[PDB]
Amino acid sequence: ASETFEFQAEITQLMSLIINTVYSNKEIFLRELISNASDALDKIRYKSLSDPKQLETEPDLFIRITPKPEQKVLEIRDSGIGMTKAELINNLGTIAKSGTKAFMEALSAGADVSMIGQFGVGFYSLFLVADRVQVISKSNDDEQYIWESNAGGSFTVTLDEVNERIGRGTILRLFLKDDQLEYLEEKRIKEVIKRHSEFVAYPIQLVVTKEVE
Amino acid sequence: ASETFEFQAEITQLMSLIINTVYSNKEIFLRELISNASDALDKIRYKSLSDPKQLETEPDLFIRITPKPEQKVLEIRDSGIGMTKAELINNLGTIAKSGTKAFMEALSAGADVSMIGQFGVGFYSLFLVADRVQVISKSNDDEQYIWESNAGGSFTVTLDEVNERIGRGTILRLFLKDDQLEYLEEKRIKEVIKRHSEFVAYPIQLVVTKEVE
Ligand SMILES: Nc1ncnc2c1ncn2[C@@H]1O[C@H](COP(=O)(O)OP(=O)(O)O)[C@@H](O)[C@H]1O
Ligand SMILES: Nc1ncnc2c1ncn2[C@@H]1O[C@H](COP(=O)(O)OP(=O)(O)O)[C@@H](O)[C@H]1O
């Protein structure tokens, strides 16, 4: 069974603001999610310095992007530190985030939406191109769990019994808006990645499906 | 919890014979599995002629090949008719198969292993390149189940609570032998496919993972 939680009020406001913004540089969501993925990977690598065993659940450190055309879904995966159930609830919704209000105020002053990451709330930039998101995570410290949101004021967390097993890490499953399906296309994804992510220490793998001739 | 079943004696013999054979044309396993996939797709299409709703669980009819290097696994998927729990138990092990003994006898006489499909036991050709296999299937008539075998005399069937949800169809998850890892390579898979599968009515999709430059 799923458990429902309430978002901290300001986060709900930020989400409403983002999913509705007519901003023109929506592609920035990928840079923010790849950046978060890279950070999660840095954390497991660092932790492993004094606890090498932590790497064994998934020895390969990578960031992987997988378009799922039929479902109009785009997945951004990492084999980073992952999030336990408590962390999902804590880190993605119930706790007040320092920059949330600050960023919204900056936005009102004329700040570029691209600044979202510098305010520490880059995760929510995903609502620029998706109206729904499932965060599937597996931390060495917990079972695999699914956190889900539709930018509304509440989210759910459910023990994962329906998705592929992740050795360790997180999958951001974005359910793209109908007018943002260009991010399912290989060429588009490739150019967005090359443009704002040249100094990423991990391999960024793009999964492409090609019909055999 | 898993349920264990005994293989019909002759099937166990055939498996032992196949997994141990030093045969030189091992690549034929792909043609046999793609052929089985095509047959499963023919069946759902035919059934849909008088029961169109059966297609809604997965409107796209395809065959998809996905190499998983890290796990040394190769998956052959189809969105065909799928198999219920009873069918997995029945069709893949417990019931005597007409050609089983006939094929082994033909083999002893000097018959080419490639004839396996004409004897109706082409599925087991997978043991030419894999020492273990998981058959994940979802029939519109049942839940998603996992059938698993290591060519031993018994197999297990478990309600699926660990793999990605299949709308409808079957996934043959082959755990490749250490000396058969060439079938994880794109070029190799492509040539094997083009050679013995030109008259397949469905798109055969190859999933490739490429690091972004
Ligand atoms: N891919 C991920 N792996 C692990 N944790 C993540 C991931 N993405 C986001 N988080 C967690 O949720 C929090 C919210 O994300 P975000 O707003 O982008 O924060 P920050 O700007 O600090 O990265 C993060 O601080 C982090 O703890
Ligand atoms: N991809 C599949 N989808 C549905 N059923 C399958 C699939 N592969 C094998 N089967 C089932 O298990 C049986 C055993 O496979 P196989 O030995 O190749 O049989 P056959 O030669 O009749 O195709 C098949 O007759 C079929 O009913």
Tab-separated table of C-alpha atoms and ligand atoms in Angstrom:
chain	number	residue	atom	x	y	z
A	1	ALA	CA	0.000	0.000	0.000
A	2	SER	CA	1.073	3.583	-0.669
A	3	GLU	CA	1.637	6.213	2.003
A	4	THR	CA	0.687	9.825	1.326
A	5	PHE	CA	2.588	12.870	2.577
A	6	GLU	CA	2.063	16.613	2.395
A	7	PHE	CA	4.598	18.814	0.628
A	8	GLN	CA	6.009	21.745	2.596
A	9	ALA	CA	3.807	24.677	1.458
A	10	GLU	CA	6.567	26.635	-0.307
A	11	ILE	CA	7.629	23.595	-2.314
A	12	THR	CA	4.041	23.224	-3.546
A	13	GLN	CA	4.154	26.898	-4.567
A	14	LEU	CA	7.444	26.474	-6.398
A	15	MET	CA	6.085	23.436	-8.252
A	16	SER	CA	2.935	25.249	-9.312
A	17	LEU	CA	5.116	28.134	-10.463
A	18	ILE	CA	7.457	25.886	-12.471
A	19	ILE	CA	4.912	23.606	-14.155
A	20	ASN	CA	2.969	26.667	-15.299
A	21	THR	CA	5.844	28.949	-16.366
A	22	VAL	CA	6.027	29.793	-20.062
A	23	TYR	CA	9.832	30.047	-19.727
A	24	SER	CA	11.680	29.492	-23.019
A	25	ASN	CA	14.811	27.584	-21.912
A	26	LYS	CA	13.092	24.403	-20.631
A	27	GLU	CA	16.052	22.235	-21.675
A	28	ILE	CA	17.859	23.300	-18.482
A	29	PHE	CA	16.063	20.537	-16.556
A	30	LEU	CA	18.497	17.939	-17.930
A	31	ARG	CA	21.558	19.837	-16.728
A	32	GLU	CA	20.016	20.065	-13.241
A	33	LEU	CA	19.141	16.356	-13.039
A	34	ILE	CA	22.513	15.268	-14.431
A	35	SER	CA	24.150	17.550	-11.878
A	36	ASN	CA	22.118	15.925	-9.054
A	37	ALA	CA	23.044	12.497	-10.416
A	38	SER	CA	26.729	13.452	-10.442
A	39	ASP	CA	26.445	14.655	-6.841
A	40	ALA	CA	24.845	11.356	-5.765
A	41	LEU	CA	27.685	9.484	-7.457
A	42	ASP	CA	30.280	11.689	-5.694
A	43	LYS	CA	28.702	10.773	-2.377
A	44	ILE	CA	28.859	6.989	-2.778
A	45	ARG	CA	32.458	7.268	-4.058
A	46	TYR	CA	33.422	9.384	-1.048
A	47	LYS	CA	31.627	7.113	1.418
A	48	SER	CA	33.430	4.146	-0.171
A	49	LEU	CA	36.795	5.641	0.787
A	50	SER	CA	36.320	4.272	4.306
A	51	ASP	CA	33.654	1.683	3.495
A	52	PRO	CA	34.656	-0.024	0.195
A	53	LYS	CA	31.899	-2.663	0.523
A	54	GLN	CA	29.327	0.030	-0.255
A	55	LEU	CA	30.381	-0.166	-3.914
A	56	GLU	CA	29.666	-3.886	-4.349
A	57	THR	CA	25.903	-3.436	-4.777
A	58	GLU	CA	26.708	-1.780	-8.117
A	59	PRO	CA	30.433	-1.421	-8.946
A	60	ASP	CA	29.728	0.627	-12.103
A	61	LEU	CA	29.432	4.394	-11.588
A	62	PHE	CA	27.371	5.975	-14.356
A	63	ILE	CA	24.556	8.286	-15.420
A	64	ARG	CA	22.124	6.769	-17.943
A	65	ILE	CA	19.379	8.426	-19.989
A	66	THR	CA	16.627	6.189	-21.367
A	67	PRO	CA	13.795	7.486	-23.553
A	68	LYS	CA	10.582	5.413	-23.536
A	69	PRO	CA	8.618	6.825	-26.517
A	70	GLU	CA	5.551	4.608	-26.191
A	71	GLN	CA	5.010	5.705	-22.594
A	72	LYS	CA	6.146	9.277	-23.326
A	73	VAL	CA	8.620	8.821	-20.491
A	74	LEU	CA	12.253	9.884	-20.080
A	75	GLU	CA	14.374	8.276	-17.386
A	76	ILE	CA	17.528	9.739	-15.877
A	77	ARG	CA	19.345	7.133	-13.824
A	78	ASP	CA	22.478	7.099	-11.666
A	79	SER	CA	24.237	4.432	-9.603
A	80	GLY	CA	24.897	6.977	-6.875
A	81	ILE	CA	24.160	6.863	-3.150
A	82	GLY	CA	20.400	6.455	-3.543
A	83	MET	CA	17.724	7.387	-1.020
A	84	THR	CA	16.140	5.300	1.759
A	85	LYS	CA	12.418	5.661	2.433
A	86	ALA	CA	13.086	8.257	5.164
A	87	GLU	CA	15.374	10.226	2.854
A	88	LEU	CA	12.821	10.291	0.024
A	89	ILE	CA	10.183	11.690	2.403
A	90	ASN	CA	12.678	14.076	3.989
A	91	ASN	CA	14.755	15.237	0.997
A	92	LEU	CA	11.972	15.519	-1.592
A	93	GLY	CA	9.053	17.249	0.075
A	94	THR	CA	8.260	17.368	3.784
A	95	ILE	CA	11.222	19.464	4.945
A	96	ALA	CA	11.526	23.177	4.212
A	97	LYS	CA	14.317	23.885	1.723
A	98	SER	CA	16.427	27.016	2.311
A	99	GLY	CA	16.392	28.368	-1.231
A	100	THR	CA	12.753	27.620	-2.110
A	101	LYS	CA	11.293	30.989	-1.110
A	102	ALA	CA	14.513	32.834	-2.018
A	103	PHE	CA	14.416	31.485	-5.589
A	104	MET	CA	10.748	32.374	-6.057
A	105	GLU	CA	11.493	35.899	-4.856
A	106	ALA	CA	14.488	36.112	-7.188
A	107	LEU	CA	12.239	34.875	-10.005
A	108	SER	CA	9.746	37.644	-9.288
A	109	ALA	CA	12.585	40.165	-9.531
A	110	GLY	CA	13.468	38.967	-13.022
A	111	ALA	CA	15.962	36.190	-12.276
A	112	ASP	CA	16.476	33.562	-14.966
A	113	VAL	CA	14.818	30.215	-14.213
A	114	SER	CA	18.191	28.624	-15.011
A	115	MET	CA	19.417	29.908	-11.639
A	116	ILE	CA	17.270	27.268	-9.922
A	117	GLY	CA	20.252	25.004	-9.251
A	118	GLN	CA	22.229	27.727	-7.472
A	119	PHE	CA	19.322	28.071	-5.045
A	120	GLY	CA	19.497	24.344	-4.294
A	121	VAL	CA	16.135	23.375	-5.750
A	122	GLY	CA	17.173	22.214	-9.207
A	123	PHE	CA	15.316	18.926	-8.818
A	124	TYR	CA	11.970	20.689	-9.307
A	125	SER	CA	13.132	22.026	-12.683
A	126	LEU	CA	11.827	18.704	-14.011
A	127	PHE	CA	8.309	20.102	-13.911
A	128	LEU	CA	9.361	22.351	-16.776
A	129	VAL	CA	8.901	19.386	-19.146
A	130	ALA	CA	6.944	16.814	-17.101
A	131	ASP	CA	3.591	16.940	-15.312
A	132	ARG	CA	4.267	13.789	-13.289
A	133	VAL	CA	7.371	12.109	-11.879
A	134	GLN	CA	8.291	8.864	-10.151
A	135	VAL	CA	11.559	8.751	-8.223
A	136	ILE	CA	12.682	5.115	-7.909
A	137	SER	CA	15.562	4.741	-5.471
A	138	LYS	CA	17.625	2.042	-3.842
A	139	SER	CA	20.043	3.003	-1.077
A	140	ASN	CA	22.298	0.297	0.379
A	141	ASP	CA	20.529	1.187	3.636
A	142	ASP	CA	16.966	0.372	2.585
A	143	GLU	CA	14.671	-1.435	0.162
A	144	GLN	CA	13.754	-0.037	-3.232
A	145	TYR	CA	11.024	2.615	-2.943
A	146	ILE	CA	8.946	4.743	-5.301
A	147	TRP	CA	8.254	8.407	-4.534
A	148	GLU	CA	5.643	9.950	-6.849
A	149	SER	CA	4.346	13.472	-7.503
A	150	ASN	CA	2.111	15.312	-9.984
A	151	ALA	CA	3.142	18.768	-8.720
A	152	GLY	CA	0.127	18.732	-6.414
A	153	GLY	CA	0.385	19.412	-2.692
A	154	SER	CA	0.937	15.774	-1.743
A	155	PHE	CA	3.134	12.856	-2.760
A	156	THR	CA	3.201	9.121	-2.158
A	157	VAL	CA	5.925	6.661	-1.231
A	158	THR	CA	5.480	2.966	-1.989
A	159	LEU	CA	7.710	-0.062	-1.456
A	160	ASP	CA	8.798	-1.002	-4.998
A	161	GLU	CA	7.290	-4.240	-6.251
A	162	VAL	CA	6.806	-3.219	-9.892
A	163	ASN	CA	10.061	-1.855	-11.362
A	164	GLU	CA	13.334	-3.424	-12.412
A	165	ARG	CA	15.733	-3.954	-9.521
A	166	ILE	CA	18.311	-1.189	-9.183
A	167	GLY	CA	21.566	-2.462	-7.668
A	168	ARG	CA	21.988	0.944	-6.102
A	169	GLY	CA	21.030	4.446	-7.144
A	170	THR	CA	18.120	6.494	-8.362
A	171	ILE	CA	15.886	6.705	-11.407
A	172	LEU	CA	14.032	9.898	-12.174
A	173	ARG	CA	11.103	8.703	-14.328
A	174	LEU	CA	9.684	11.791	-16.042
A	175	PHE	CA	6.244	11.592	-17.639
A	176	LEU	CA	6.740	14.267	-20.299
A	177	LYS	CA	4.111	16.867	-21.188
A	178	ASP	CA	2.532	16.422	-24.628
A	179	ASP	CA	4.382	19.403	-26.112
A	180	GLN	CA	7.754	18.371	-24.669
A	181	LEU	CA	8.198	15.060	-26.485
A	182	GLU	CA	11.302	16.342	-28.266
A	183	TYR	CA	13.308	15.139	-25.272
A	184	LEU	CA	12.592	11.548	-26.303
A	185	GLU	CA	14.599	12.123	-29.492
A	186	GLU	CA	18.234	11.042	-29.594
A	187	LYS	CA	19.560	14.062	-31.502
A	188	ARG	CA	17.847	16.534	-29.171
A	189	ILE	CA	18.965	14.773	-25.990
A	190	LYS	CA	22.523	14.624	-27.313
A	191	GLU	CA	22.750	18.348	-28.092
A	192	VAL	CA	21.245	19.391	-24.759
A	193	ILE	CA	23.754	17.165	-22.942
A	194	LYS	CA	26.814	18.347	-24.875
A	195	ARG	CA	25.860	21.982	-24.346
A	196	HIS	CA	25.515	22.208	-20.569
A	197	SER	CA	27.413	19.175	-19.246
A	198	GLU	CA	31.034	18.947	-20.446
A	199	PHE	CA	32.663	18.678	-17.030
A	200	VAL	CA	30.890	15.630	-15.647
A	201	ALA	CA	33.279	13.052	-14.164
A	202	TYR	CA	31.050	10.081	-14.997
A	203	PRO	CA	30.086	8.445	-18.273
A	204	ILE	CA	26.712	9.664	-19.486
A	205	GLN	CA	25.092	6.794	-21.357
A	206	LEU	CA	22.220	7.301	-23.778
A	207	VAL	CA	20.094	4.226	-24.466
A	208	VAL	CA	18.886	4.122	-28.045
A	209	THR	CA	16.504	1.662	-29.661
A	210	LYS	CA	17.086	0.997	-33.348
A	211	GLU	CA	15.119	-1.331	-35.597
A	212	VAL	CA	17.424	-3.830	-37.275
A	213	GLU	CA	17.545	-3.456	-41.057
B	1	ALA	CA	7.769	-17.603	-2.329
B	2	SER	CA	8.941	-19.719	-5.259
B	3	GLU	CA	7.376	-23.003	-6.326
B	4	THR	CA	9.575	-25.799	-7.652
B	5	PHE	CA	8.618	-28.227	-10.415
B	6	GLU	CA	10.250	-31.247	-12.008
B	7	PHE	CA	11.120	-31.223	-15.700
B	8	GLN	CA	9.795	-34.097	-17.806
B	9	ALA	CA	12.766	-36.527	-17.902
B	10	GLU	CA	13.445	-36.238	-21.646
B	11	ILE	CA	13.530	-32.449	-21.479
B	12	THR	CA	16.189	-32.684	-18.759
B	13	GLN	CA	18.153	-35.001	-21.067
B	14	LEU	CA	17.840	-32.633	-24.007
B	15	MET	CA	19.012	-29.716	-21.855
B	16	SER	CA	22.030	-31.616	-20.581
B	17	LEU	CA	22.807	-32.568	-24.172
B	18	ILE	CA	22.512	-28.982	-25.446
B	19	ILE	CA	24.389	-27.139	-22.690
B	20	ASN	CA	27.279	-29.581	-23.063
B	21	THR	CA	27.445	-29.877	-26.871
B	22	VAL	CA	30.594	-28.543	-28.517
B	23	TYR	CA	28.507	-27.674	-31.606
B	24	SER	CA	30.043	-24.907	-33.739
B	25	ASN	CA	26.967	-22.963	-34.934
B	26	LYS	CA	25.758	-21.696	-31.521
B	27	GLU	CA	24.408	-18.476	-33.058
B	28	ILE	CA	21.292	-20.396	-34.153
B	29	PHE	CA	19.741	-19.821	-30.713
B	30	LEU	CA	18.778	-16.261	-31.696
B	31	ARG	CA	16.905	-17.383	-34.804
B	32	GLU	CA	14.952	-19.894	-32.689
B	33	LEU	CA	14.015	-17.370	-29.985
B	34	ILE	CA	13.091	-14.682	-32.518
B	35	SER	CA	10.971	-17.279	-34.298
B	36	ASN	CA	9.190	-18.147	-31.008
B	37	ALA	CA	8.699	-14.435	-30.344
B	38	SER	CA	7.191	-13.967	-33.807
B	39	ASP	CA	4.838	-16.893	-33.181
B	40	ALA	CA	3.695	-15.387	-29.860
B	41	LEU	CA	3.022	-12.098	-31.641
B	42	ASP	CA	1.032	-13.908	-34.374
B	43	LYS	CA	-1.140	-15.443	-31.680
B	44	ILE	CA	-2.134	-12.206	-29.938
B	45	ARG	CA	-2.815	-10.577	-33.336
B	46	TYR	CA	-5.018	-13.504	-34.358
B	47	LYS	CA	-6.842	-13.597	-31.023
B	48	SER	CA	-7.439	-9.842	-31.368
B	49	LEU	CA	-9.400	-10.419	-34.577
B	50	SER	CA	-12.433	-11.343	-32.472
B	51	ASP	CA	-11.297	-9.753	-29.209
B	52	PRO	CA	-9.708	-6.354	-30.061
B	53	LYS	CA	-9.457	-5.352	-26.372
B	54	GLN	CA	-6.667	-7.903	-25.943
B	55	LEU	CA	-4.323	-5.487	-27.732
B	56	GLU	CA	-4.834	-2.567	-25.333
B	57	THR	CA	-2.464	-3.927	-22.673
B	58	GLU	CA	0.355	-3.215	-25.141
B	59	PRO	CA	-0.723	-1.845	-28.555
B	60	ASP	CA	2.831	-2.031	-29.966
B	61	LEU	CA	3.798	-5.360	-31.555
B	62	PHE	CA	7.565	-5.826	-31.523
B	63	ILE	CA	10.581	-8.005	-30.779
B	64	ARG	CA	13.323	-6.286	-28.754
B	65	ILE	CA	16.878	-7.413	-28.006
B	66	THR	CA	18.627	-5.833	-25.020
B	67	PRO	CA	22.219	-6.632	-24.053
B	68	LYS	CA	23.133	-6.062	-20.384
B	69	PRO	CA	26.967	-6.252	-20.401
B	70	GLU	CA	27.513	-5.682	-16.686
B	71	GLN	CA	25.256	-8.607	-15.799
B	72	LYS	CA	26.444	-10.661	-18.791
B	73	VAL	CA	22.784	-10.980	-19.726
B	74	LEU	CA	20.988	-10.843	-23.081
B	75	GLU	CA	17.241	-10.297	-23.169
B	76	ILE	CA	14.933	-11.206	-26.034
B	77	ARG	CA	11.527	-9.640	-25.539
B	78	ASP	CA	8.219	-9.720	-27.417
B	79	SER	CA	4.813	-8.129	-26.840
B	80	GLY	CA	3.128	-11.345	-27.924
B	81	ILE	CA	0.470	-13.448	-26.208
B	82	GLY	CA	2.530	-14.150	-23.090
B	83	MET	CA	2.148	-17.082	-20.711
B	84	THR	CA	0.028	-17.416	-17.552
B	85	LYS	CA	1.464	-19.270	-14.563
B	86	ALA	CA	-0.211	-22.524	-15.679
B	87	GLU	CA	1.143	-22.113	-19.207
B	88	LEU	CA	4.710	-21.515	-18.002
B	89	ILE	CA	4.577	-24.725	-15.939
B	90	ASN	CA	2.838	-26.617	-18.738
B	91	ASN	CA	4.581	-25.282	-21.868
B	92	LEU	CA	8.140	-25.057	-20.524
B	93	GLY	CA	8.827	-28.245	-18.612
B	94	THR	CA	6.287	-30.542	-16.978
B	95	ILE	CA	4.560	-31.830	-20.120
B	96	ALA	CA	6.211	-34.267	-22.520
B	97	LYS	CA	7.045	-32.606	-25.841
B	98	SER	CA	6.543	-34.686	-29.007
B	99	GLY	CA	9.843	-33.904	-30.701
B	100	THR	CA	12.123	-34.045	-27.641
B	101	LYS	CA	13.151	-37.695	-27.949
B	102	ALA	CA	12.874	-37.617	-31.759
B	103	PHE	CA	15.347	-34.716	-31.995
B	104	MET	CA	17.845	-36.370	-29.653
B	105	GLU	CA	17.662	-39.528	-31.755
B	106	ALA	CA	18.106	-37.494	-34.936
B	107	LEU	CA	21.084	-35.780	-33.289
B	108	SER	CA	22.661	-39.148	-32.535
B	109	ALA	CA	22.261	-40.074	-36.203
B	110	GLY	CA	24.229	-37.014	-37.282
B	111	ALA	CA	21.476	-34.405	-37.614
B	112	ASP	CA	22.519	-30.761	-37.417
B	113	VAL	CA	21.648	-29.066	-34.117
B	114	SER	CA	20.083	-26.293	-36.218
B	115	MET	CA	17.185	-28.670	-36.910
B	116	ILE	CA	16.017	-28.196	-33.313
B	117	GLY	CA	13.248	-25.793	-34.327
B	118	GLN	CA	11.724	-28.220	-36.831
B	119	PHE	CA	11.342	-30.713	-33.986
B	120	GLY	CA	9.434	-28.119	-31.958
B	121	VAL	CA	11.964	-27.693	-29.170
B	122	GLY	CA	13.840	-24.629	-30.382
B	123	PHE	CA	13.380	-22.855	-27.057
B	124	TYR	CA	16.020	-25.079	-25.438
B	125	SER	CA	18.585	-23.980	-28.035
B	126	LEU	CA	19.216	-21.099	-25.626
B	127	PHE	CA	21.351	-23.401	-23.510
B	128	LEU	CA	23.858	-23.323	-26.351
B	129	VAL	CA	25.020	-19.900	-25.105
B	130	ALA	CA	23.516	-19.589	-21.603
B	131	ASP	CA	23.797	-21.723	-18.468
B	132	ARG	CA	20.807	-20.085	-16.780
B	133	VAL	CA	17.576	-18.488	-17.986
B	134	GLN	CA	14.668	-16.541	-16.529
B	135	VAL	CA	11.453	-16.394	-18.540
B	136	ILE	CA	9.451	-13.332	-17.446
B	137	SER	CA	5.934	-13.375	-18.863
B	138	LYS	CA	2.714	-11.432	-18.636
B	139	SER	CA	-0.398	-12.846	-20.289
B	140	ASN	CA	-3.578	-10.744	-20.264
B	141	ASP	CA	-5.016	-13.729	-18.380
B	142	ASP	CA	-2.659	-13.703	-15.395
B	143	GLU	CA	-0.159	-11.762	-13.300
B	144	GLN	CA	3.478	-11.383	-14.267
B	145	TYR	CA	5.478	-14.512	-13.385
B	146	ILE	CA	9.103	-15.628	-13.507
B	147	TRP	CA	10.032	-19.138	-14.653
B	148	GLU	CA	13.698	-19.992	-14.030
B	149	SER	CA	16.022	-22.843	-15.023
B	150	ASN	CA	19.731	-23.719	-14.904
B	151	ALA	CA	19.331	-26.762	-17.181
B	152	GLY	CA	18.976	-28.929	-14.084
B	153	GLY	CA	16.084	-31.330	-13.583
B	154	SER	CA	13.857	-28.786	-11.847
B	155	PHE	CA	12.621	-25.240	-12.371
B	156	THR	CA	10.883	-22.598	-10.296
B	157	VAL	CA	7.975	-20.258	-10.926
B	158	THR	CA	7.597	-17.102	-8.848
B	159	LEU	CA	5.065	-14.270	-8.898
B	160	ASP	CA	7.056	-11.319	-10.291
B	161	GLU	CA	7.755	-8.609	-7.742
B	162	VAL	CA	11.252	-7.661	-8.929
B	163	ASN	CA	11.250	-6.898	-12.676
B	164	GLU	CA	9.945	-4.045	-14.779
B	165	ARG	CA	6.253	-4.359	-15.599
B	166	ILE	CA	5.599	-5.867	-19.020
B	167	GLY	CA	2.341	-4.596	-20.531
B	168	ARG	CA	1.988	-7.957	-22.207
B	169	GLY	CA	4.447	-10.477	-23.572
B	170	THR	CA	7.548	-12.401	-22.660
B	171	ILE	CA	11.176	-11.701	-21.849
B	172	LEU	CA	13.761	-14.416	-22.255
B	173	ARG	CA	16.562	-13.305	-19.894
B	174	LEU	CA	19.655	-15.299	-20.865
B	175	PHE	CA	22.589	-15.430	-18.458
B	176	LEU	CA	25.351	-15.978	-21.018
B	177	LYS	CA	28.227	-18.416	-20.527
B	178	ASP	CA	31.631	-16.779	-20.010
B	179	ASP	CA	32.871	-17.739	-23.481
B	180	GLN	CA	29.692	-16.582	-25.232
B	181	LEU	CA	29.844	-12.881	-24.372
B	182	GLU	CA	30.141	-11.941	-28.043
B	183	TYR	CA	26.344	-11.908	-28.165
B	184	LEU	CA	26.354	-8.778	-26.004
B	185	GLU	CA	28.098	-6.902	-28.826
B	186	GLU	CA	26.010	-4.810	-31.205
B	187	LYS	CA	27.866	-5.752	-34.398
B	188	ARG	CA	27.660	-9.477	-33.653
B	189	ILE	CA	23.974	-9.394	-32.717
B	190	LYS	CA	23.209	-7.420	-35.871
B	191	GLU	CA	24.938	-9.866	-38.228
B	192	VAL	CA	23.358	-12.925	-36.614
B	193	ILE	CA	19.919	-11.307	-36.942
B	194	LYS	CA	20.326	-10.222	-40.568
B	195	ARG	CA	21.568	-13.670	-41.557
B	196	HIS	CA	18.784	-15.940	-40.319
B	197	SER	CA	15.782	-13.628	-39.873
B	198	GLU	CA	14.862	-11.636	-43.001
B	199	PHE	CA	11.220	-12.682	-43.191
B	200	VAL	CA	10.000	-11.590	-39.775
B	201	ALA	CA	6.774	-9.559	-39.916
B	202	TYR	CA	7.584	-7.515	-36.809
B	203	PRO	CA	10.158	-4.827	-36.115
B	204	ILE	CA	13.216	-6.253	-34.394
B	205	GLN	CA	14.588	-3.545	-32.125
B	206	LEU	CA	18.130	-3.614	-30.780
B	207	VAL	CA	18.738	-1.531	-27.658
B	208	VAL	CA	22.179	0.032	-27.658
B	209	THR	CA	23.860	2.035	-24.920
B	210	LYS	CA	26.310	4.680	-26.092
B	211	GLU	CA	28.336	7.047	-23.937
B	212	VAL	CA	27.713	10.645	-24.955
B	213	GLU	CA	30.808	12.373	-26.329
C	1	LIG	N1	19.771	11.540	-8.033
C	1	LIG	C1	19.707	11.746	-6.699
C	1	LIG	N2	20.287	10.822	-5.849
C	1	LIG	C2	20.264	10.972	-4.503
C	1	LIG	N3	19.634	12.057	-3.991
C	1	LIG	C3	19.029	13.013	-4.767
C	1	LIG	C4	19.046	12.882	-6.168
C	1	LIG	N4	18.398	13.924	-6.655
C	1	LIG	C5	17.980	14.694	-5.630
C	1	LIG	N5	18.373	14.127	-4.478
C	1	LIG	C6	18.131	14.606	-3.067
C	1	LIG	O1	16.969	15.440	-2.860
C	1	LIG	C7	17.395	16.790	-2.543
C	1	LIG	C8	16.617	17.807	-3.393
C	1	LIG	O2	17.210	17.933	-4.679
C	1	LIG	P1	17.645	19.402	-5.186
C	1	LIG	O3	16.559	20.354	-5.029
C	1	LIG	O4	18.205	19.430	-6.562
C	1	LIG	O5	18.809	19.712	-4.173
C	1	LIG	P2	20.248	20.276	-4.339
C	1	LIG	O6	20.191	21.596	-5.085
C	1	LIG	O7	20.850	20.416	-2.963
C	1	LIG	O8	20.967	19.126	-5.235
C	1	LIG	C9	18.908	16.799	-2.709
C	1	LIG	O9	19.599	17.669	-1.796
C	1	LIG	C10	19.313	15.364	-2.536
C	1	LIG	O10	19.606	15.047	-1.174
C	2	LIG	N1	8.110	-16.002	-26.535
C	2	LIG	C1	7.138	-16.884	-26.210
C	2	LIG	N2	5.865	-16.413	-25.948
C	2	LIG	C2	4.845	-17.244	-25.623
C	2	LIG	N3	5.104	-18.572	-25.540
C	2	LIG	C3	6.342	-19.114	-25.778
C	2	LIG	C4	7.414	-18.271	-26.123
C	2	LIG	N4	8.470	-19.047	-26.290
C	2	LIG	C5	8.108	-20.327	-26.065
C	2	LIG	N5	6.802	-20.356	-25.754
C	2	LIG	C6	5.948	-21.551	-25.407
C	2	LIG	O1	6.635	-22.696	-24.852
C	2	LIG	C7	6.609	-23.785	-25.811
C	2	LIG	C8	8.012	-24.393	-25.963
C	2	LIG	O2	8.788	-23.624	-26.873
C	2	LIG	P1	9.458	-24.372	-28.137
C	2	LIG	O3	10.187	-25.557	-27.720
C	2	LIG	O4	10.292	-23.489	-28.994
C	2	LIG	O5	8.166	-24.765	-28.943
C	2	LIG	P2	7.765	-24.651	-30.441
C	2	LIG	O6	8.823	-25.316	-31.300
C	2	LIG	O7	6.405	-25.285	-30.603
C	2	LIG	O8	7.748	-23.042	-30.671
C	2	LIG	C9	5.990	-23.210	-27.077
C	2	LIG	O9	5.196	-24.146	-27.826
C	2	LIG	C10	5.179	-22.039	-26.601
C	2	LIG	O10	3.837	-22.408	-26.280
